[PDB]
């Protein structure tokens, strides 16, 4: 990877860039014919929002996603990981990938609510004040439809609406 350092000495600023150590993909992938990192390691349909060891490889230091052109993921897998990362942040599983705060900013104390499999951003969702009849019930989404094809080890399929 490459770092950019700004050093201001007196009246003169100097912007430079240095090449730091770069991690290398583990040798001998089990599926060399695979077209992206996911299927090269036979990981398609076999990871979830809590697989942070997997998810953390595709995000920036501050929690943002990395471009698909850089990672090499396909569109389908890139979108799954993107949603999984959002759920991982919301579940509190990435405590060292928090947003950058400008100097002098200390967030105020906010109520702590433990949550997981959170599809939407909390602030953008309204209360279900009218539930509706049994035959037209308003449901509370859980998880992501992008993961509907994940390997299911139970006889019941994943319920995405509660």
């Amino acid at each position: 990877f490459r770092e950019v350092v700004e050093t201001q000495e007196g009246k003169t600023t100097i912007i430079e860039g240095r090449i730091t150590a770069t991690p290398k993909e583990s040798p001998n992938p089990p599926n060399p014919s695979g077209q992206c990192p996911i299927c090269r390691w036979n990981l398609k349909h076999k990871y979830n929002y809590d697989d942070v060891l997997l998810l953390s490889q595709f995000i920036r230091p501050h929690g943002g996603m990395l471009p698909r052109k850089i990672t090499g993921l396909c569109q389908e897998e890139h979108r799954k990981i993107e949603e999984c990362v959002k759920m991982a942040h919301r579940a509190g599983l990435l405590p060292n990938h928090r947003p950058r705060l400008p100097e002098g900013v200390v967030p105020k104390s906010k109520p702590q609510l433990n949550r997981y499999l959170t599809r939407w951003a909390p602030g953008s969702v309204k209360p279900i004040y009218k539930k509706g009849p049994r035959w037209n019930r308003v449901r509370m989404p859980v998880g992501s439809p992008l993961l509907r094809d994940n390997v299911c080890y139970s006889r019941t399929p994943w319920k995405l609406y509660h």
Binding site: N28, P30, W41, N42, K46
Partner: peptide, 8 residues
């Protein structure tokens, strides 16, 4: 050290 069907 990874077999053909190895999955992490």
């Amino acid at each position: 050290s990874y077999l053909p069907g190895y999955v992490p």
